[PDB]
Design a protein around this motif. Structure first.
Motif, mmCIF file in Angstrom:
data_model
loop_
_atom_site.group_PDB
_atom_site.id
_atom_site.type_symbol
_atom_site.label_atom_id
_atom_site.label_comp_id
_atom_site.label_asym_id
_atom_site.label_seq_id
_atom_site.Cartn_x
_atom_site.Cartn_y
_atom_site.Cartn_z
ATOM 1 N N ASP A 36 1.041 -1.159 0.015
ATOM 2 C CA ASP A 36 0.082 -0.028 0.072
ATOM 3 C C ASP A 36 0.789 1.338 -0.250
ATOM 4 O O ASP A 36 2.242 1.238 0.216
ATOM 5 C CB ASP A 36 -1.050 -0.048 0.980
ATOM 6 N N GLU A 37 0.203 2.368 -0.272
ATOM 7 C CA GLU A 37 0.895 3.661 -0.451
ATOM 8 C C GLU A 37 1.562 4.038 1.119
ATOM 9 O O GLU A 37 2.183 5.114 1.075
ATOM 10 C CB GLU A 37 -0.060 4.565 -1.043
ATOM 11 N N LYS A 38 1.213 3.643 2.068
ATOM 12 C CA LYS A 38 1.447 3.700 3.545
ATOM 13 C C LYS A 38 2.807 3.104 3.800
ATOM 14 O O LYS A 38 3.292 3.277 4.738
ATOM 15 C CB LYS A 38 0.402 3.392 4.507
ATOM 16 N N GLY A 39 3.307 2.119 2.831
ATOM 17 C CA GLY A 39 4.389 1.356 3.144
ATOM 18 C C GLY A 39 4.375 0.037 3.907
ATOM 19 O O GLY A 39 5.269 -0.346 4.266
ATOM 20 N N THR A 40 2.907 -0.346 4.131
ATOM 21 C CA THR A 40 2.809 -1.611 4.885
ATOM 22 C C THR A 40 3.427 -2.803 4.091
ATOM 23 O O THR A 40 3.277 -2.597 2.827
ATOM 24 C CB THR A 40 1.230 -1.916 4.796
ATOM 25 N N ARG A 50 -2.578 -6.616 13.019
ATOM 26 C CA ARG A 50 -2.266 -5.409 13.633
ATOM 27 C C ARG A 50 -1.719 -5.623 14.922
ATOM 28 O O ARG A 50 -1.996 -6.416 15.542
ATOM 29 C CB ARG A 50 -3.506 -4.392 13.604
ATOM 30 N N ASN A 53 -1.337 -0.577 14.291
ATOM 31 C CA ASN A 53 -0.562 -0.448 12.953
ATOM 32 C C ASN A 53 -0.496 -1.802 12.655
ATOM 33 O O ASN A 53 -0.270 -2.908 13.350
ATOM 34 C CB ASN A 53 0.982 -0.020 13.509
ATOM 35 N N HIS A 111 -6.671 -6.075 3.285
ATOM 36 C CA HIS A 111 -6.448 -5.314 1.901
ATOM 37 C C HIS A 111 -6.906 -6.139 0.859
ATOM 38 O O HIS A 111 -7.000 -7.220 0.807
ATOM 39 C CB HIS A 111 -4.984 -5.341 1.765
#
Ligand SMILES: OC[C@H]1O[C@@](CO)(O[C@H]2O[C@H](CO)[C@@H](O)[C@H](O)[C@H]2O)[C@@H](O)[C@@H]1O
Ligand SMILES: OC[C@H]1O[C@@](CO)(O[C@H]2O[C@H](CO)[C@@H](O)[C@H](O)[C@H]2O)[C@@H](O)[C@@H]1O
Ligand SMILES: OC[C@H]1O[C@@](CO)(O[C@H]2O[C@H](CO)[C@@H](O)[C@H](O)[C@H]2O)[C@@H](O)[C@@H]1O
Ligand SMILES: [Cu+2]
Ligand SMILES: [Cu+2]
Ligand SMILES: [Cu+2]
Ligand SMILES: [Cu+2]
Ligand SMILES: [Cu+2]
Ligand SMILES: [Cu+2]
Lengths: 333, 333, 333
Positions: C44-48, C179, C184, C209
């Motif tokens: 994802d764009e959060k860096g997960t 999480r 997180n 996701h």
């Protein structure tokens, strides 16, 4: 575009504005108005409240009916009394994200969109402003349906006309109402105040309520659906976000377009059908027995416990050939 | 109603009582008895227990088989050894909530219902007492199926007969067993004691177990399904409350009625099909290869981790044309 | 087996290796190589991050294309740089659990499996080592698809050829990233380290996701899908574990095989279709309007909030007959 214009007076669901099935009219520009209303509503018999956002004040939005090759000209109105931008996406339309890319309006604005009805069937319409607002506006109630009929009316795929005596539109809504620490549903002062908690719940994919016509019990009691023995009833069912599995308890789907598109022949004699989230489907049934029917999604937990039950009250003569109580309840011998 | 009477001896799933496919018999009154049993059962290999409620002692209830135009006369028995009222709703029947409104019986009572088999296909039957008891009795195990065959047997929609060599009935059950604080499944002394915790879990829509024939592993080992290469097997699959997506690992659905209704032609050559919650469907496959097959719902988490795997053990000759291990596992060069 | 051999150079999704639709070739042995890669990736764009396991380095695995009656000969390679055993199950194949029972390979091994393409359509392939590893390897990314075309190409079921100008393969992946206490997403050093937390989450059936092509936004920006007005695009969609409901926002499915099998005629004019978990389906659309389209699963929460949106960028001339903004946004009168 120099075609005749025809205005429609929309009516609130589950009723449907008057229309022809087979028609001798040629293409027209059919004019509709939808006025958005954001409002706090009660969604269950406990008094739980809900920050709704609606087309024309209802959940679902009203059913629009036209014929193949008509042009549908919609005035979408976002009064200054609302708080958020809104738009409309017609799954029946071709181009510009269904119209969404041409209809974004702030409070105080209106827009006029026209689309050619080149695809037959029942279709979802819904708001879709952009990004995470898309799901939020839809599950807040901003969805309805349009029906595009063949000019020759419906057929069975075998050369025979299928004429309905009446049509009802059942819009199913998945709702996400958060709970506080002790387990009570929360109430909010505005849709914006509801957003954070509501999105957190949405992403977990489990609704708190699944309702027809905006509320638990909306289509029961005074507001039960009705029919008579011998009547052929068309039931349009939509779900803009989440799957459903309609079933008429004590009846059948005599002719069912579960994907909802009249270029395909109907299936026959179904017990339960399937509305894919993001679609409308339709089922016709000729009532054969009087009495109460329940119309449900056949996840029975959803139906009985989360809100998704309608009733039909049907008048006429009981048919003992089709069913009979041979022996009433008695002590086992 | 002066038709011949025929008694059926029901048999426990996954087997099916003996019947004709094509028949020269005319309509009959076909007599069935179902005796309700509430009982605590073990549902997994860990020893988890479950407050089950059943028709005829099994999950699913047994498959009833008749032909189009028969009259199905069911004696439903609720012995005094049970605790709750029960009834029966046949999705194959017309009127009175499928029969539910004519069959509510207290412990110590029986009732006799007759319905005319006017719709062909496989159909769910289930208990449906009223209100929140509806989902609870169904997910406690009170559901089965009925098959209404055309008098000419099954066909492919292209003029050809489809004759099965054997039929199995796979009833899939979503189960909701609550956990205690430290995460162990709970056990209860009665269905009534289980109700509060069980309903709270039900409304969250996630089952703890998804099983075939009442238990993890029920249709494996001694109780694997069987076939031979060359045999055409009909697999009836039902799910009264929740969707499923059947798949035969190493095979196909040669002819599939996923909505389950024989007035519609089958689809051909499927990998995975879809049983809408509240329905039965059917798939025919002619086995081409010997060995072990798994029959699953193709949510593989459900299949491998929650209980929803059956096996077939198939005898016959391996076909190297259809598949071969060209090179056994070896070190990469 | 003394047929001609043909090598294919696979290409990463959403592209598809070059192939013929209608062909004058007879049956061949078509040779493919798949090299398994376990790797930590960003989803994802959060860096997960995510412990992925892949065929050929991609999620989904690449689309393999052959014709009915070909023999598909796959060299499956499990390099010593991986940690776990793996295999392959082709839903297109007959016998031995789709090939899984003939392809289990430890790190450092390879195997060669051949299967005859006797069933037409699009089909899932996936890893399936045994037991609880089955779902885990699949939801870790080890799934792709194969297309088996009729030798005469596709048809509409009415005698007419359906020729696509281009094909894209959209593989949808449900992912389960746990999480920590403060909410997180967790990161893990190895797939084995991720297993316990990941399985606990899997069994709760809610993904963190839902992505196309392995990542949020994979099929957007530089990597948007493309077309021109007038082009007929085939969109193959697979989901090896979980249902999906594809929808082209601003378009339709002109011809749709939602169960994915070319022995069945397509449905026409769909808004939204349904991919059963454990299957591939296909939809053809002839673009009529330029501009941006979104291609989604129409659970809009999944689409907008969990990752399941692709874009098409379409060139050509706007068609004001099909849609027009009659009046731009303006103050309400
Ligand atoms: O009683 C304080 C104790 O309760 C918790 C909940 O377990 O927090 C509650 O009280 C807080 C202070 O009043 C509120 O802000 C909070 O919303 C409420 O849940 C604990 O966090 C706190 O230690
Ligand atoms: O140890 C008491 C402390 O434990 C909690 C759980 O966090 O409650 C447990 O103990 C209660 C009293 O024995 C039980 O009634 C309860 O069911 C059990 O969960 C706390 O609530 C309590 O303060
Ligand atoms: O601060 C200790 C208190 O926090 C809890 C979480 O509510 O546990 C945290 O701290 C533990 C000891 O450091 C960690 O092992 C644990 O993983 C973390 O959640 C309580 O259990 C503990 O009493
Ligand atoms: Cu809106
Ligand atoms: Cu939409
Ligand atoms: Cu009961
Ligand atoms: Cu039912
Ligand atoms: Cu693997
Ligand atoms: Cu599989």
């Amino acid at each position: 575009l120099k075609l005749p214009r025809q205005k429609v007076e929309l009516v609130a669901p589950p009723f449907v504005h008057a229309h022809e099935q087979a028609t001798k009219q040629g293409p027209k520009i059919v004019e509709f108005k939808l006025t958005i209303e954001e409002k706090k509503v009660v969604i269950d018999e406990k008094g739980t409240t809900f920050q709704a956002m609606t087309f024309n004040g209802s959940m679902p939005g009203p059913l629009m009916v036209v014929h193949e090759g008509d042009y549908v000209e919609t005035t979408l109105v976002n009064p200054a009394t609302n708080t958020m931008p809104h738009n409309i996406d017609f799954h029946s339309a071709t181009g510009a994200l269904g119209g969404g890319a041409l209809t974004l309006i702030n409070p105080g604005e209106q827009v006029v969109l026209r689309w050619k009805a080149t695809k037959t069937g029942v279709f979802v319409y819904h708001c879709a402003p952009g990004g995470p607002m898309i799901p939020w506006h839809v599950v807040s109630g901003m969805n309805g349906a349009v029906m595009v009929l063949p000019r020759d009316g419906l057929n069975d795929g075998k050369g025979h006309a299928l004429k309905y005596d009446k049509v009802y539109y059942v819009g199913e809504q998945d709702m996400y109402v958060p709970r506080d620490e002790k387990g009570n549903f929360k109430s909010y002062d505005s849709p914006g105040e509801a957003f954070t908690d509501t999105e957190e719940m949405m992403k977990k994919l489990i609704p708190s309520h699944v309702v027809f016509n905006g509320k638990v019990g909306a289509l029961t009691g005074k507001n039960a659906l009705t029919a008579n023995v011998g009547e052929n009833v068309l039931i349009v069912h939509s779900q803009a976000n989440r799957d459903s599995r309609p079933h008429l308890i004590g009846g059948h789907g005599d002719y069912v377009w579960e994907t909802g598109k009249f270029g395909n022949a109907p299936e026959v004699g179904l017990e339960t059908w399937f509305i894919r989230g993001g679609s409308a489907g339709a089922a016709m049934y000729k009532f054969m027995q009087p009495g109460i029917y329940a119309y449900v999604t056949h996840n029975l937990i959803e139906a009985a416990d989360l809100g998704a039950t309608a009733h039909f009250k049907v008048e006429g003569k009981w048919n003992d050939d089709l069913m009979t109580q041979v022996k009433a309840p008695a002590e086992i011998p």
